[PDB]
Each structure stands twice: as structure tokens, then as C-alpha cells.
Amino acid sequence: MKPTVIITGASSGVGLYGAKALIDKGWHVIMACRNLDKTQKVADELGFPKDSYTIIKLDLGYLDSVRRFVAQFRELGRPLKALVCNAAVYFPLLDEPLWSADDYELSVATNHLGHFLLCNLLLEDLKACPDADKRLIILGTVTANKIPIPAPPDLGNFEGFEAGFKKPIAMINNKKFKSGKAYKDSKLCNMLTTRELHRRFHQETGIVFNSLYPGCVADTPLFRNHYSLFRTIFPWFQKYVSQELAGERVAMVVADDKFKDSGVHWSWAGREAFSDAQKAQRMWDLSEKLVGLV
Ligand SMILES: NC(=O)C1=CN([C@@H]2O[C@H](COP(=O)(O)OP(=O)(O)OC[C@H]3O[C@@H](n4cnc5c(N)ncnc54)[C@H](OP(=O)(O)O)[C@@H]3O)[C@@H](O)[C@H]2O)C=CC1
Ligand SMILES: [Cl-]
């Protein structure tokens, strides 16, 4: 069998072009996507050969969808060599929070909590795969420590998580909703998750747990509308990596020999090994409760 990789959010941007690059390298890509009609359309638009991918429904904003995705993946009987947590949402300048299917603020629910559950469930599949080289890659932040969200992340003491994170709670630190900061908070949780996966499981399983910053992928829909609004107001600036190159960088960190060290953040590659350590442990323990692992 072709080596098998799951990519969340493969119907757009980095995920789509990562799928393209991995198909080109001889992998079978599981396009783990929420909109099946869209996903099929875009695969066909790029000429993806149907013998090299499978589309399976996944809605990261619905924890039971995550569980069903895993079950449906397992029915294929393909051993899992790699997982890429790529999917994300961002709601620019959104004054009132949106809610997941589980009544969790939608940015954190989708970007972090769904992935957090997915990683924990699929750890069994990665363990069962007999390959020596198996990898779990999380799409992260620029650095392991503007575009166009000025606000830094701040998880506080996870007061929002501690109180159970249900609506009307809207931020991890239980302060007032800010949609840009909500995105940044979620991405920091992605980075902390990578740190914790490595710490908890690398020695026991041999699986490689790394994070990736592919570059500023300015053409994707994620930040596109925010950037165009910014340029409309401040017309003082010129209009960076292509989607295709960002995808090729995903493919490298999944498949290539140079990227076999675990517990690092690959940035464009620059390499950074991993109080973030203490915060990461708390993020982990509380996230388990929120996603029903305990
Ligand atoms: N763009 C950039 O400059 C940078 C991006 N990143 C990271 O790279 C990753 C990809 O970003 P990018 O390609 O720009 O984003 P895009 O908006 O192009 O793609 C996002 C993907 O995530 C999917 N997705 C969103 N919500 C869900 C859900 N609930 N369930 C399943 N899938 C979902 C989308 O599905 P659908 O097609 O249905 O909308 C889409 O396929 C993200 O993790 C982002 O944080 C990191 C650094 C820079
Ligand atoms: Cl095959």
C-alpha cells in the first residue's frame, strides 16, 4: 500500500496543496474535510488521481464528528503513517462569539479542541502502524515562544477552561470575547499540544511530534478578507509563500529524512526545540476534560 496520511482541512489553502504535494510523492491522502461537495470539486480541479486519496467527513467543531471520522477512517483498513492537523478557522472583527456543536467558542473549539481529541484518538492508529517512521504534524505559529492580528495570545490561568468552557464563556482566560485573540489563543494551544505530545509519547512510541510554520501564505482565504479590508483603509502598502510552496513544505516535514527529529518547530527551515512547559501541561489536562477523554 501507498503510505497513508490524514490531512485535516484539505479543501483549501495549505491543506489542499499539502495533499497535492504528498500525492505527488506517492502517498495516499485522507482528505478529512467538512464539505464533501467542495472537497471533491477542488480535488478534481487540481486533477487529483482518485486512486491516491479518500474524502472522509470531518467537522472539527463537533466532537462526535471527530469520533465518527476516526471510525470511518478505520473501516478503510489502511495503516496510519502520518497525521497533519492543518484545519483552522478565523472570524475577523466578529463582535459576538460563534458556538460549536458542543457550545464551545468556535475558534478554539475547531482549531484546538477538535484536533486535541483527534490526536488522542489517532495515537492508537499511529501506534498500530508497523512503519519505523511515523509523524504527527501540527500547523502552528511563527515562533515557538501584525498578520493581521496585533494582539498576543494569553491563556491566563485557563479560567475559562476551568469553569468548563461552555457558552456564555468565550475565551480560555474567561475574559471578554475578541475574535482575533481567540484565533491566536487557539494557535498557541496547537503549539502547546505538540510540546505535550512529544513529552508524553515520543519515548514510549517513537512517533515524531512536530509543529510547522510554512510561511506567510497570504493568498489563502484564512486572512484574505481581513488583509483586503486593512489595505482598503491603509492603501499605503504593497500586496510571503505561494500556496503550492507551503504545501510542499508540509510534504517535506511529513515525508522527508531531514525532518525526523521530534519535539521541534520547523519554521521558514529554521529549527526550534521545545513556563510554556507548565502552561502546556495544564492546557493538556483541562482539554482532556473538555473533549471527554476522562
Ligand atoms: N495562511 C497563513 O498565512 C498561515 C496559516 N497557518 C496555518 O495553516 C493552516 C491552514 O491555513 P490556511 O490554508 O491559510 O487556511 P484556509 O482557510 O485556506 O483553509 C482552512 C481549511 O480548514 C478547514 N476547516 C475549517 N473549519 C473546519 C472544521 N470545522 N472541520 C474540518 N475542517 C475545517 C477548511 O474547510 P472549508 O474548505 O470547508 O472552509 C479549509 O479546508 C491553519 O492551521 C493556519 O493556522 C499558519 C501560518 C500562516
Ligand atoms: Cl494503495
Curated annotation (Swiss-Prot):
The keyword Ligase does not apply. One of its GO terms (biological process) is photosynthesis. GO terms for molecular function: protochlorophyllide reductase activity. Keywords: Chlorophyll biosynthesis, NADP, Oxidoreductase, Photosynthesis. It is an enzyme of class 1 (oxidoreductase). Its EC number is 1.3.1.33. It comes from the Bacteria. The keyword Oxidoreductase applies. Pathway: Porphyrin-containing compound metabolism; chlorophyll biosynthesis. It catalyses: chlorophyllide a + NADP(+) = protochlorophyllide a + NADPH + H(+). It holds the Pfam family adh_short. Belongs to the short-chain dehydrogenases/reductases (SDR) family. POR subfamily. NCBIfam families: LPOR (TIGR01289). Phototransformation of protochlorophyllide (Pchlide) to chlorophyllide (Chlide). PANTHER family: PROTOCHLOROPHYLLIDE REDUCTASE A, CHLOROPLASTIC, PROTOCHLOROPHYLLIDE REDUCTASE C, CHLOROPLASTIC. This is Light-dependent protochlorophyllide reductase. It comes from Synechocystis sp. (strain ATCC 27184 / PCC 6803 / Kazusa). The lineage of its organism: Bacteria, Bacillati, Cyanobacteriota, Cyanophyceae, Synechococcales. The gene is por.
